[PDB]
């Protein structure tokens, strides 16, 4: 019903006592070209938590606004 693949790891923002991390990655969902993805991950990255996927245009819009 759904697949994911971390194609590139870009940045970790924090890690908690359980080893879960908040990361910015390029992630391919359902085989689509990889997109920016800001999300919590288990230590071995086989479980994911809540997060948001952003197009390149959305991510650029965000960075340019807050730089």
Consult the annotation and say whether 26 binds a ligand: no
Phi first, then psi: give them for residue 3, nearest 5 degrees: -130, 160
What is the edge-to-edge ordering of all strands in the sheet holding 21-29? 4-15, 21-29, 35-41, 48-54
Q: Which residue has the tokens 């230590």?
A: 43
3-state secondary structure of 61: helix
CA distance 58 to 35: 10
- The class that CATH gives domain 1-67 is mainly beta
Asked whether residue 39 is marked as a ligand-binding residue, the answer is yes
The answer to whether the beta carbons of residues 48 and 39 sit under 8 Å apart is: yes
DSSP string, 15-59: E-TTS-EEEEEEEEETTPPPEEEEEEE-TTSSSEEEEEEE-HHHH
Is 22 annotated in some ligand binding site?
no
How far is residue 54's CA from residue 46's CA, in Å, rounded to a whole number?
21
How determined?
X-ray
DSSP, res 9: E
Q: With beta carbons less than 8 A apart as the criterion, state whether 10 and 18 touch.
A: no
């Amino acid at each position: 019903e759904f697949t994911f693949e971390i194609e590139e790891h870009l940045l970790t923002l924090s890690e908690n006592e359980k080893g879960w991390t908040k990361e910015i990655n390029r992630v391919s969902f359902n085989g689509a070209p990889a997109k920016f993805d800001i999300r919590a991950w288990s230590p071995d990255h086989t479980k994911m938590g809540k997060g948001i996927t952003l197009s390149n245009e959305e991510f650029q819009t965000m960075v340019d606004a807050f730089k």
